[PDB]
Write a protein that binds this DNA or RNA. Structure first.
Ligand code: FES
Ligand SMILES: [K+]
Ligand SMILES: [K+]
Ligand SMILES: [K+]
Ligand SMILES: [K+]
Ligand SMILES: [Mg+2]
Ligand SMILES: [Mg+2]
Ligand SMILES: [Mg+2]
Ligand SMILES: [Mg+2]
Ligand SMILES: [Mg+2]
Ligand SMILES: [Mg+2]
Ligand SMILES: [Mg+2]
Ligand SMILES: [Mg+2]
Ligand SMILES: [Mg+2]
Ligand SMILES: [Mg+2]
Ligand SMILES: [Mg+2]
Ligand SMILES: [Mg+2]
Ligand SMILES: [Mg+2]
Ligand SMILES: [Mg+2]
Ligand SMILES: [Mg+2]
Ligand SMILES: [Mg+2]
Ligand SMILES: [Mg+2]
Ligand SMILES: [Mg+2]
Ligand SMILES: [Mg+2]
Ligand SMILES: [Mg+2]
Lengths: 164, 108, 115, 232
RNA sequence: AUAGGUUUGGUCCUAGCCUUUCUAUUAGCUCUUAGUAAGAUUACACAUGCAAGCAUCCCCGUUCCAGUGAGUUCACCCUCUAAAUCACCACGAUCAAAAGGGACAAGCAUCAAGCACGCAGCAAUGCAGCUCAAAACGCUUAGCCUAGCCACACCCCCACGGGAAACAGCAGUGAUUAACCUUUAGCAAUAAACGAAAGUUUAACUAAGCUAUACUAACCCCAGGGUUGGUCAAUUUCGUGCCAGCCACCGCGGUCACACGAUUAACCCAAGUCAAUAGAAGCCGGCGUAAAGAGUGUUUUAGAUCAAAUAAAGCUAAAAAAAUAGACUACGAAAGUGGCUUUAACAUAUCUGAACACACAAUAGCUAAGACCCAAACUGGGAUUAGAUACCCCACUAUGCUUAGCAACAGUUAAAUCAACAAAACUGCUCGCCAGAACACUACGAGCCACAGCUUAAAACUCAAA
C-alpha cells in the first residue's frame, strides 16, 4: 500500500480540495507551532493536513515552519505592502484556522468565478485549430459544408487535375 | 525504502538497452570471406551451414545460412538479419534468402 | 522571435485540403509564414458554397477593431471581405472590376446582336 | 467447446454433479475444471461447482484415472458449498483486498454492464457463483489452489448492507450519479436507530493502493490495460 | 495485464527470459481501382536549369519565405527599454531587441572537490571571502516543452583575416546506407516584395507526376502471405532416419515424425502478409535461509513525534594467576571484568541520523633493545621398510617473555497467526542496502598504506536459467 500514515494527503484530488487561495498581497506565511501541548493540537493538525493544500493552491507563496520557538502557536502573513498579519491559533481546530485565513486573506468565490470566466474567453469556440487549442480543425467538420476530400472525393469539376 | 530515500534517489533509471549484432539496424550488407560448417551444442547433432562475413560496419561476424542447399562463395554480397540460431553458440546473424547473391532455396 | 522591422497585419491563412480551401482570418507579423505563428485568430472564411448556397465568413469585429487600433495592417483580400460585409467601404477595385465585367458582358451581348 | 486454450483442461465443464447418497439431486449445478496435474502416476484435479445463485464450492480429487478424480472432486465439492452474498444479484457488496499465502487478490465492485474483467479462473468461478460485474487483479504467485481458496475466503467474508446497518444502527444511503442527488436507502437497522451521527472524519486513515491512485491520476500508461476483449 | 510458457524426481517460493497487444522502418513473397495524407540513410561531394525584384532615376526589398538538426539549458516569466507599425503633435497602445532578476533535458560520484570562482567603499584601497554529497566542478548523450520554438547556414564557435570556391532552396546527380519521389505547369487563389495605382515578380505556394508507408471508399472477373507439437486458431499421405533440416521460449529429427521436405486439408489476416530491427508498458517491492541489516561508542546539516567496570600504587594465602564464596548473574559501549587494601572513578532529560572525525576493540606479524629455565615452526644428526615413522630420539634457531614504538527507536496482542524451515505475529518512524546467473572478495580509477596488500568497484563475451 501507499507508504506513511494518511496516504490520501499525497493524492492530487486531496491537494486540490484546498479552498484557500490567497490574495496577491500575500508573499510569505510563517507557521510557528509546538510539538507538545493539547492547546496547540489543532495547529499541529493544520501543519499535517492543510499546509500541503495551501501550498498547492498558492505555489508562489513562501511557506516556512518553525517548531518550539514560542510558548504559543501562531501564523504570520507578510504582505507586499510591508504589512504583517498575526493570527493566534491556540484552542482552534485546523478547520477553524482554515476558515479564519480564508476569510481574512482568501479570495472570495465571486473573484474566483470572475477569473474562470476570464480564462474562458481565451478559448473562443469559433476558432479553428489543433485539438490542443480548438474544438475543430477545419470548417469541413461542420455539417452542411463541403467535407474533406480524404473522406469524400470531390466532383471532377472542382479539381484542378480536370480543370487544367 | 522510505519516502525520503525514494525522493533522494529519484525515479528509477533504466539502463540503456544493449545493441545487438546488427547494432540496432534491421539488416546489414556483408561480403562473404569464407564458408564452412559448425556442429550444434549437444542435445542435437548436425552440420550447420555457416559463413564468415565482413559487414558494412567493418566487423567480421559468423552468420547462419538457412534452408537446404546454398551456393554462396567468397567475395559474394549477402544481406544478414538478426535472430539467434538456437543450436549454435555465438552465431547471432542470419543470411537473408533471395537477396543479392544468395538465391532462394531450390524447390525440393 | 525578433524580426528586423515588420508589423502586424490581418490576413488570410490557408488551411483545408487539396481542392478544398479554407481560410482563417488572423493577425500576425507580416514576416511570419502564411500558415505559421500568429498573434490571434480573428475569424474564418469558407469560400466553397455550403448546402444552403452560402459562403460563411466569421469576423471577430471587436478584436478586428482592437488590432486595427493597435496599428495592424490589412491585406487586400481582407479589405475586400470587410467591404462586402459592410464594415468598410467597398474597395475601389471591386467597383472597377464590376465595371470592367459589365463592359465585357455588354461587348458579348453586342456580339450576339451583331451575329 | 474448448477451455482456456485448445489443449487445456481448465475451464471445461464436467456436467452436473451426480445425485448424492443423501438423496439430493444437483441438476441446477454446473461443474468446471480449474486444474489437472500429474502426481508422480496419479492425477490430482481441482474443480469448482455452482448453481449460479450464490451457492458454489470447490474440491480436490486424487485418483489413478482422470474420470475417477473428476467424480471424486465433484461429489466432494457439492458437500462443501459456500453461500456467496451478491449485491443486487450481479456484483459484490464492496471492494475486497486479501492475501492468501503469497497470492494477493484485489476485487472491485462494479456497476451493471461492466462485465467480468478478471483472471480467467476467477471468471469461471464468478460465472458459477452468479457474479456478473466485477474487476479483479491477482498479484504475487499465481497459484491456482491458493487463488481459489483466497477467492472463496474473501467472497465468503463480505459484509452485506443489512449487516452494516445493524452493526452501526444507521441507514445505509446509496448515491448514484445516474440518479442525481436522490438518496436511495438500501438498508435500515432492524433495531433502534442511533440519533447521534457518525463522526465526520475530515481525513480518514485508510490504507490506499498506489495502483488505484496512479490509475485515477492518469499516470498509468500500461499498453495492456483496458484492451478490447470478448464478452465475459 | 484478466494474464500465459519455461528451473524440479516432485511441491512451494523467489527470480530472469520469452509469448499474446499497438505502432514505425527495412527485407522476402504478392498486389485491381479511386480520393487523401506522408515521403534521401548521410551537416558527404555536387554537373545542369531555375528559386528576388519593383519602380519616372532616389530609395525600398533581396535580413523574409524556403532548408537542415551539426552544435546545444540564448526559447519561458518579471523589470527596464531600443528599433518597428499606428497614433504619425505626442498622450499612448501594439510588437519586440540589448541589459538586470528568476526558471529551464538525460546518464555517470570509478567526475568530490572547484581554484578566484566574494563582499565593502565616491575612489584610494580594505576584509578573505565565494560554490559544493540538498551534487559544485567535470565527462558523455541528445534539437526542444511542436498553432510552434531554438540553433545553424562549407570549415576555422565568431569571420577583420585564412582554408578554399560551398544545392542543409526546388528539380536532379555521384558516393554511401538495410534505407533511393518528377532535372512538371502557373502566378488563377492565399502569402511576401515593390508601386500612388492599373499592376509586376516569387521552385513560398497552388494544381499536377511517382511510391501499398498510411487512412477512406470500392471492386464487373480478379488473393496472396504466414501458420497448423504446447503456449496459440488449425494436418492427410509420402520422403528422410540425430542426416537433411526446423524453433520466439519449451523443444523436434535414431523406420508409425500431427514439430524437417513435398503433398492434401484446415486456421489467421487480407491488397496485403509478417521476417528483422526499434519503440510503446517497469520498482510505494523487499533485505534470517533466495540480491540485499552482527565489531563498539560519541558528535554531525537535518528528519521524526517515540520529547566481578576502569586506571594507579601497594600487599598476599594455598600452591606467575587467584580453590570456596559463585546453586551469585552483577559491572562495562563492545571487547571484556571474579585474591585483599587504599586513591581517583563509572558521559548525556526525547529519538533517528559518519566509509569520509575521534576514541576504543580483537586479529597476528614487523622495527630498536634486553632476558632466556623450559618449550619449539625451520636447520642438522641417530634409528628404522624395502619410496622406511610425516609420526620415535638428540641439539639448537624464529617465536612464546620484558619494555620503547609503528538494523535503531517507540507502541500492540487486536485481527485472517502463518508459502516452507528458522525465531509467535504485526504496526509507526528513520537510516543503510538490494533489483537473474557468471564474468567479479575481479580489471581500471581513486584513497590508504607499503615485502603478502586493504576499501570502493565495472564492462565485453556467454546462458535460460541461477
Ligand atoms: S481537415 Fe478540413 S478539409 Fe480536411
Ligand atoms: K522600389
Ligand atoms: K541537432
Ligand atoms: K558554425
Ligand atoms: K498569385
Ligand atoms: Mg489447438
Ligand atoms: Mg515467470
Ligand atoms: Mg512489405
Ligand atoms: Mg518547400
Ligand atoms: Mg522607438
Ligand atoms: Mg533579451
Ligand atoms: Mg546531435
Ligand atoms: Mg553542402
Ligand atoms: Mg559560421
Ligand atoms: Mg535538392
Ligand atoms: Mg523509405
Ligand atoms: Mg513530392
Ligand atoms: Mg516558372
Ligand atoms: Mg502532391
Ligand atoms: Mg512439416
Ligand atoms: Mg545472501
Ligand atoms: Mg543518535
Ligand atoms: Mg542505524
Ligand atoms: Mg581488490
Ligand atoms: Mg574504472
Amino acid at each position: 500500500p501507499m507508504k506513511g500514515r494518511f496516504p490520501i494527503r499525497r493524492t492530487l484530488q486531496y491537494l486540490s480540495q484546498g479552498n484557500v487561495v490567497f490574495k496577491d498581497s500575500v508573499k510569505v506565511m510563517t507557521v510557528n507551532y509546538n510539538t507538545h501541548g493539547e492547546l496547540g493540537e489543532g495547529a499541529r493538525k493544520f501543519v499535517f493536513f492543510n499546509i500541503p493544500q495551501i501550498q498547492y493552491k498558492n505555489p508562489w507563496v513562501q511557506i516556512m515552519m518553525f517548531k518550539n520557538m514560542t510558548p504559543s502557536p501562531f501564523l504570520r502573513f507578510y504582505l507586499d505592502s510591508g504589512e504583517q498579519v498575526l493570527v493566534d491559533v491556540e484552542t482552534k481546530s485546523n478547520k477553524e484556522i482554515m476558515e479564519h485565513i480564508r476569510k481574512i486573506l482568501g479570495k472570495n468565490e465571486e473573484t474566483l468565478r470572475e477569473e474562470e470566466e476570464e480564462k474562458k474567453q481565451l478559448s473562443h469556440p469559433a476558432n479553428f485549430g489543433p485539438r490542443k487549442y480548438c474544438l475543430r480543425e477545419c470548417i469541413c467538420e461542420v455539417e452542411g459544408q463541403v467535407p474533406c476530400p480524404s473522406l469524400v472525393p470531390l466532383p471532377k469539376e472542382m479539381r484542378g487535375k480536370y480543370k487544367a | 525504502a522510505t519516502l525520503n530515500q525514494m525522493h533522494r534517489l529519484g525515479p528509477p533509471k533504466r539502463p540503456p538497452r544493449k545493441l545487438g549484432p546488427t547494432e540496432g539496424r534491421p539488416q546489414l550488407k556483408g561480403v562473404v570471406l569464407c564458408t564452412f560448417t559448425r556442429k550444434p551444442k549437444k542435445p542435437n547433432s548436425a552440420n550447420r551451414k555457416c559463413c564468415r562475413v565482413r559487414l558494412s560496419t567493418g566487423r567480421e561476424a559468423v552468420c547462419f545460412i538457412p534452408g537446404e542447399g546454398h551456393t554462396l562463395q567468397e567475395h559474394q554480397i549477402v544481406l544478414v538479419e538478426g535472430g539467434r540460431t538456437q543450436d549454435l553458440p555465438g552465431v547471432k546473424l542470419t543470411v537473408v534468402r533471395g537477396k543479392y547473391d544468395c538465391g532462394h532455396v531450390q524447390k525440393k | 522571435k525578433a524580426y528586423r522591422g515588420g508589423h502586424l497585419t490581418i490576413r488570410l491563412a490557408l488551411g483545408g485540403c487539396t481542392n478544398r480551401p479554407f481560410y482563417r482570418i488572423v493577425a500576425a507579423h507580416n514576416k511570419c509564414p502564411r500558415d505559421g505563428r500568429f498573434v490571434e485568430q480573428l475569424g474564418s472564411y469558407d469560400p466553397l458554397p455550403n448546402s444552403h448556397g452560402e459562403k460563411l465568413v466569421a469576423l471577430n469585429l471587436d478584436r478586428i477593431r482592437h488590432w486595427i487600433g493597435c496599428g495592424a495592417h490589412l491585406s487586400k483580400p481582407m479589405e475586400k471581405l470587410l467591404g462586402l460585409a459592410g464594415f468598410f467601404p467597398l474597395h475601389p477595385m471591386m467597383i472597377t472590376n464590376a465595371e470592367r465585367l459589365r463592359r465585357k458582358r455588354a461587348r458579348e451581348v453586342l456580339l450576339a446582336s451583331q451575329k | 467447446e474448448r477451455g482456456w486454450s485448445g489443449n487445456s483442461w481448465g475451464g471445461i465443464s464436467l456436467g452436473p454433479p451426480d445425485p448424492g447418497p443423501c438423496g439430493e439431486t444437483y441438476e441446477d449445478f454446473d461443474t468446471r475444471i480449474l486444474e489437472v496435474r500429474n502426481v508422480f502416476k496419479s492425477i490430482r484435479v481441482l474443480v469448482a461447482v455452482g448453481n449460479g445463485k450464490g451457492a458454489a464450492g470447490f474440491s480436490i480429487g486424487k485418483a489413478t484415472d482422470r474420470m475417477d478424480a473428476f467424480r471424486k472432486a465433484k461429489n466432494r465439492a457439492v458437500h462443501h458449498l459456500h453461500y456467496i452474498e451478491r449485491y443486487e444479484d450481479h456484483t459484490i457488496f464492496h471492494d475486497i483486498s486479501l492475501r492468501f499465502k503469497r497470492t494477493h487478490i484485489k476485487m472491485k465492485k462494479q456497476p451493471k454492464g461492466y462485465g467480468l474483467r478478471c483472471h480467467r479462473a476467477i471468471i469461471t468461478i464468478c460465472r458459477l457463483i452468479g457474479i456478473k460485474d466485477m474487476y479483479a487483479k491477482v498479484s504475487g504467485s499465481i497459484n491456482m489452489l491458493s487463488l481459489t481458496q483466497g477467492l472463496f475466503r474473501g467472497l465468503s467474508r463480505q459484509e452485506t448492507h443489512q449487516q452494516l446497518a445493524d452493526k452501526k444502527g444507521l441507514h445505509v444511503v446509496e448515491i448514484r450519479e445516474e440518479c442525481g442527488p436522490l438518496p436511495i436507502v438500501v438498508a435500515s437497522p432492524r433495531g433502534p436507530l442511533r440519533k447521534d451521527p457518525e463522526p465526520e472524519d475530515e481525513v480518514p486513515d485508510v490504507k490506499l493502493d498506489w495502483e488505484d491512485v496512479k490509475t485515477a491520476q492518469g499516470m498509468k500508461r500500461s499498453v495492456w490495460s483496458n484492451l478490447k476483449r470478448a464478452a465475459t
